[PDB]
Amino acid sequence: PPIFLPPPNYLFVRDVWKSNLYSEFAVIRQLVSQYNHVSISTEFVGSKVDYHYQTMRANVDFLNPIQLGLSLSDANGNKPDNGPSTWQFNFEFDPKKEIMSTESLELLRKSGINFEKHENLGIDVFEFSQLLMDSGLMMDDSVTWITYHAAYDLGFLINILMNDSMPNNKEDFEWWVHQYMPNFYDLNLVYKIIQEFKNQYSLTTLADELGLPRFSIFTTTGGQSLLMLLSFCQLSKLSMHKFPNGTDFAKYQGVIYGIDGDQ
Ligand SMILES: [Ca+2]
Ligand SMILES: [Xe]
C-alpha cells in the first residue's frame, strides 16, 4: 500500500486543560468556517439495533469522560499550516470516585493518562459543553461531523449538550442527534460497507490500508480523532466519494444504526 504521510505539522495534538480551554475554543471558532470537517473521539472511564441503543442508554449517564479529541480540516483534508488543528480535551477526574477496576485504571495509565493532572487541571464537562454549543460546530449543516462507532460518542455528546434529559427511545435519540449534527458520517459504517463489497473494521486496519504510518501520537484520544479525519478525507479522495458501485457516500449521511431497510 503506497505510504500516505500527511504534512508533518498536521500530526500535532494540542492538549487542553482548564487553563487554556477558552483560548483554544476561540481558535476553533475562527477556523471552523474554513476547516468545516470535525472528527470526534472519546475515552470514558467506567433487533440488534434496539439492543445497542438500550445498552448505550443504560450506560451513558454512568460513563464519565476522561478525554475527548476534536480534529478540524476542510473536505480535502487540508489543515492550517500554522497552529494546532487537533485538540485533546482532558476532563476533571475525582481521585476518590471508586467507579473503576484496576484492569481499566492500569490500562488507562499506559495509554498516557496522568490522573494527578486530571484532578487538578481537568476541565469541567458542563463548561466544555457550553463552549461546544456556541462554537458554531452544532446545528449547522455547513459543518460535517466525522465519527467512528458513533452511537456512544453522540450518545454522550447529546447527553451533555442537553439538560441531562436523555431521550427515551432510539427514534427520539436519532431526532435530537440530527438536530445537533445535521451533517455527519460514521466512518466505521462507510468502511464496513465498502470493505464488505469486496468480500477487520477497526480504525487501525483502515488507516493501514490507506498507508498511514503507525505514529504513536495516533494512540492517544486526540490522535484518534486525528487519525479518523485523515482517514475519512483520504478514503473519500481516493473514492471520489463513491462506493464501489457508484453510489454516493452521502447516502449514509446521518446513519447511526443502519440504513432504512437494513435495520
Ligand atoms: Ca473563520
Ligand atoms: Xe449530538
PDB file of all heavy atoms in Angstrom, residues 25-40:
ATOM      1  N   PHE A  25     -10.847  27.292  22.364  1.00  0.00           N
ATOM      2  CA  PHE A  25     -12.147  27.327  21.731  1.00  0.00           C
ATOM      3  C   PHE A  25     -12.279  28.587  20.884  1.00  0.00           C
ATOM      4  O   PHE A  25     -13.071  28.633  19.943  1.00  0.00           O
ATOM      5  CB  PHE A  25     -13.268  27.259  22.758  1.00  0.00           C
ATOM      6  CG  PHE A  25     -13.986  25.946  22.751  1.00  0.00           C
ATOM      7  CD1 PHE A  25     -13.669  24.958  23.670  1.00  0.00           C
ATOM      8  CD2 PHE A  25     -14.909  25.655  21.744  1.00  0.00           C
ATOM      9  CE1 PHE A  25     -14.253  23.693  23.584  1.00  0.00           C
ATOM     10  CE2 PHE A  25     -15.494  24.398  21.651  1.00  0.00           C
ATOM     11  CZ  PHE A  25     -15.163  23.412  22.576  1.00  0.00           C
ATOM     12  N   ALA A  26     -11.489  29.607  21.206  1.00  0.00           N
ATOM     13  CA  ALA A  26     -11.521  30.841  20.421  1.00  0.00           C
ATOM     14  C   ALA A  26     -10.898  30.517  19.056  1.00  0.00           C
ATOM     15  O   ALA A  26     -11.384  30.972  18.022  1.00  0.00           O
ATOM     16  CB  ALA A  26     -10.737  31.940  21.124  1.00  0.00           C
ATOM     17  N   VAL A  27      -9.832  29.715  19.064  1.00  0.00           N
ATOM     18  CA  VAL A  27      -9.163  29.301  17.827  1.00  0.00           C
ATOM     19  C   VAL A  27     -10.068  28.379  17.006  1.00  0.00           C
ATOM     20  O   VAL A  27     -10.156  28.509  15.791  1.00  0.00           O
ATOM     21  CB  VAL A  27      -7.842  28.547  18.122  1.00  0.00           C
ATOM     22  CG1 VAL A  27      -7.261  27.977  16.825  1.00  0.00           C
ATOM     23  CG2 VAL A  27      -6.842  29.485  18.792  1.00  0.00           C
ATOM     24  N   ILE A  28     -10.735  27.439  17.672  1.00  0.00           N
ATOM     25  CA  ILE A  28     -11.638  26.515  16.984  1.00  0.00           C
ATOM     26  C   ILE A  28     -12.714  27.328  16.262  1.00  0.00           C
ATOM     27  O   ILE A  28     -13.028  27.099  15.101  1.00  0.00           O
ATOM     28  CB  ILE A  28     -12.323  25.559  18.001  1.00  0.00           C
ATOM     29  CG1 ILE A  28     -11.289  24.576  18.554  1.00  0.00           C
ATOM     30  CG2 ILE A  28     -13.498  24.815  17.336  1.00  0.00           C
ATOM     31  CD1 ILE A  28     -11.789  23.744  19.727  1.00  0.00           C
ATOM     32  N   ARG A  29     -13.260  28.288  16.984  1.00  0.00           N
ATOM     33  CA  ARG A  29     -14.298  29.166  16.491  1.00  0.00           C
ATOM     34  C   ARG A  29     -13.923  29.903  15.195  1.00  0.00           C
ATOM     35  O   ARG A  29     -14.762  30.065  14.307  1.00  0.00           O
ATOM     36  CB  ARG A  29     -14.637  30.169  17.592  1.00  0.00           C
ATOM     37  CG  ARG A  29     -16.064  30.666  17.613  1.00  0.00           C
ATOM     38  CD  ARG A  29     -16.276  31.568  18.839  1.00  0.00           C
ATOM     39  NE  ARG A  29     -16.120  30.812  20.072  1.00  0.00           N
ATOM     40  CZ  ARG A  29     -15.382  31.190  21.110  1.00  0.00           C
ATOM     41  NH1 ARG A  29     -14.712  32.336  21.085  1.00  0.00           N
ATOM     42  NH2 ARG A  29     -15.307  30.405  22.178  1.00  0.00           N
ATOM     43  N   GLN A  30     -12.679  30.348  15.058  1.00  0.00           N
ATOM     44  CA  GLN A  30     -12.339  31.066  13.835  1.00  0.00           C
ATOM     45  C   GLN A  30     -11.826  30.168  12.720  1.00  0.00           C
ATOM     46  O   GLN A  30     -11.702  30.606  11.590  1.00  0.00           O
ATOM     47  CB  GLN A  30     -11.353  32.223  14.109  1.00  0.00           C
ATOM     48  CG  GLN A  30      -9.895  31.865  14.205  1.00  0.00           C
ATOM     49  CD  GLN A  30      -9.179  31.842  12.857  1.00  0.00           C
ATOM     50  OE1 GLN A  30      -8.124  31.228  12.731  1.00  0.00           O
ATOM     51  NE2 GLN A  30      -9.737  32.518  11.857  1.00  0.00           N
ATOM     52  N   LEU A  31     -11.558  28.904  13.022  1.00  0.00           N
ATOM     53  CA  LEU A  31     -11.081  28.001  11.978  1.00  0.00           C
ATOM     54  C   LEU A  31     -12.237  27.269  11.312  1.00  0.00           C
ATOM     55  O   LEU A  31     -12.195  27.002  10.109  1.00  0.00           O
ATOM     56  CB  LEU A  31     -10.114  26.945  12.550  1.00  0.00           C
ATOM     57  CG  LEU A  31      -8.746  27.343  13.105  1.00  0.00           C
ATOM     58  CD1 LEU A  31      -8.100  26.134  13.785  1.00  0.00           C
ATOM     59  CD2 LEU A  31      -7.868  27.866  11.982  1.00  0.00           C
ATOM     60  N   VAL A  32     -13.282  26.972  12.083  1.00  0.00           N
ATOM     61  CA  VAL A  32     -14.393  26.185  11.550  1.00  0.00           C
ATOM     62  C   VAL A  32     -15.039  26.598  10.230  1.00  0.00           C
ATOM     63  O   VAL A  32     -15.394  25.725   9.439  1.00  0.00           O
ATOM     64  CB  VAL A  32     -15.507  25.956  12.618  1.00  0.00           C
ATOM     65  CG1 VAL A  32     -16.253  27.245  12.911  1.00  0.00           C
ATOM     66  CG2 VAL A  32     -16.487  24.867  12.125  1.00  0.00           C
ATOM     67  N   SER A  33     -15.189  27.892   9.961  1.00  0.00           N
ATOM     68  CA  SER A  33     -15.803  28.292   8.685  1.00  0.00           C
ATOM     69  C   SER A  33     -15.049  27.709   7.484  1.00  0.00           C
ATOM     70  O   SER A  33     -15.653  27.363   6.476  1.00  0.00           O
ATOM     71  CB  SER A  33     -15.880  29.821   8.560  1.00  0.00           C
ATOM     72  OG  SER A  33     -14.587  30.407   8.575  1.00  0.00           O
ATOM     73  N   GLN A  34     -13.731  27.588   7.590  1.00  0.00           N
ATOM     74  CA  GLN A  34     -12.929  27.027   6.505  1.00  0.00           C
ATOM     75  C   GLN A  34     -12.672  25.527   6.720  1.00  0.00           C
ATOM     76  O   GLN A  34     -12.831  24.695   5.810  1.00  0.00           O
ATOM     77  CB  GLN A  34     -11.582  27.761   6.398  1.00  0.00           C
ATOM     78  CG  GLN A  34     -10.706  27.249   5.265  1.00  0.00           C
ATOM     79  CD  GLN A  34      -9.448  28.086   5.077  1.00  0.00           C
ATOM     80  OE1 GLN A  34      -9.342  29.191   5.599  1.00  0.00           O
ATOM     81  NE2 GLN A  34      -8.496  27.560   4.317  1.00  0.00           N
ATOM     82  N   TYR A  35     -12.244  25.191   7.928  1.00  0.00           N
ATOM     83  CA  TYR A  35     -11.967  23.806   8.264  1.00  0.00           C
ATOM     84  C   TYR A  35     -13.237  23.294   8.919  1.00  0.00           C
ATOM     85  O   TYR A  35     -13.298  23.090  10.136  1.00  0.00           O
ATOM     86  CB  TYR A  35     -10.750  23.752   9.178  1.00  0.00           C
ATOM     87  CG  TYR A  35      -9.547  24.382   8.506  1.00  0.00           C
ATOM     88  CD1 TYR A  35      -9.156  25.692   8.804  1.00  0.00           C
ATOM     89  CD2 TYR A  35      -8.849  23.693   7.510  1.00  0.00           C
ATOM     90  CE1 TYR A  35      -8.107  26.301   8.126  1.00  0.00           C
ATOM     91  CE2 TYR A  35      -7.797  24.287   6.823  1.00  0.00           C
ATOM     92  CZ  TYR A  35      -7.431  25.589   7.135  1.00  0.00           C
ATOM     93  OH  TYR A  35      -6.392  26.177   6.448  1.00  0.00           O
ATOM     94  N   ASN A  36     -14.246  23.109   8.063  1.00  0.00           N
ATOM     95  CA  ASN A  36     -15.587  22.700   8.464  1.00  0.00           C
ATOM     96  C   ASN A  36     -15.872  21.216   8.647  1.00  0.00           C
ATOM     97  O   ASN A  36     -17.031  20.828   8.810  1.00  0.00           O
ATOM     98  CB  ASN A  36     -16.637  23.331   7.520  1.00  0.00           C
ATOM     99  CG  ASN A  36     -16.457  22.924   6.045  1.00  0.00           C
ATOM    100  OD1 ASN A  36     -15.786  21.940   5.730  1.00  0.00           O
ATOM    101  ND2 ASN A  36     -17.079  23.684   5.138  1.00  0.00           N
ATOM    102  N   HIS A  37     -14.835  20.386   8.606  1.00  0.00           N
ATOM    103  CA  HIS A  37     -14.997  18.947   8.843  1.00  0.00           C
ATOM    104  C   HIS A  37     -14.405  18.700  10.237  1.00  0.00           C
ATOM    105  O   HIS A  37     -13.250  19.030  10.501  1.00  0.00           O
ATOM    106  CB  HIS A  37     -14.258  18.115   7.783  1.00  0.00           C
ATOM    107  CG  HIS A  37     -15.025  17.939   6.507  1.00  0.00           C
ATOM    108  ND1 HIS A  37     -15.473  19.004   5.750  1.00  0.00           N
ATOM    109  CD2 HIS A  37     -15.447  16.821   5.869  1.00  0.00           C
ATOM    110  CE1 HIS A  37     -16.142  18.546   4.705  1.00  0.00           C
ATOM    111  NE2 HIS A  37     -16.143  17.225   4.753  1.00  0.00           N
ATOM    112  N   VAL A  38     -15.214  18.133  11.124  1.00  0.00           N
ATOM    113  CA  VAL A  38     -14.817  17.880  12.504  1.00  0.00           C
ATOM    114  C   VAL A  38     -14.949  16.404  12.887  1.00  0.00           C
ATOM    115  O   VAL A  38     -16.024  15.814  12.745  1.00  0.00           O
ATOM    116  CB  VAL A  38     -15.725  18.666  13.479  1.00  0.00           C
ATOM    117  CG1 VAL A  38     -15.113  18.703  14.881  1.00  0.00           C
ATOM    118  CG2 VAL A  38     -15.954  20.063  12.942  1.00  0.00           C
ATOM    119  N   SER A  39     -13.867  15.814  13.382  1.00  0.00           N
ATOM    120  CA  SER A  39     -13.907  14.418  13.817  1.00  0.00           C
ATOM    121  C   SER A  39     -13.897  14.434  15.342  1.00  0.00           C
ATOM    122  O   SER A  39     -13.367  15.365  15.958  1.00  0.00           O
ATOM    123  CB  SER A  39     -12.686  13.663  13.320  1.00  0.00           C
ATOM    124  OG  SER A  39     -11.520  14.248  13.867  1.00  0.00           O
ATOM    125  N   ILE A  40     -14.493  13.417  15.944  1.00  0.00           N
ATOM    126  CA  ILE A  40     -14.537  13.325  17.393  1.00  0.00           C
ATOM    127  C   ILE A  40     -14.215  11.923  17.893  1.00  0.00           C
ATOM    128  O   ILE A  40     -14.563  10.924  17.269  1.00  0.00           O
ATOM    129  CB  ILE A  40     -15.919  13.744  17.942  1.00  0.00           C
ATOM    130  CG1 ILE A  40     -15.949  13.554  19.462  1.00  0.00           C
ATOM    131  CG2 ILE A  40     -17.027  12.940  17.252  1.00  0.00           C
ATOM    132  CD1 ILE A  40     -17.277  13.870  20.087  1.00  0.00           C
TER     133      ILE A  40
END
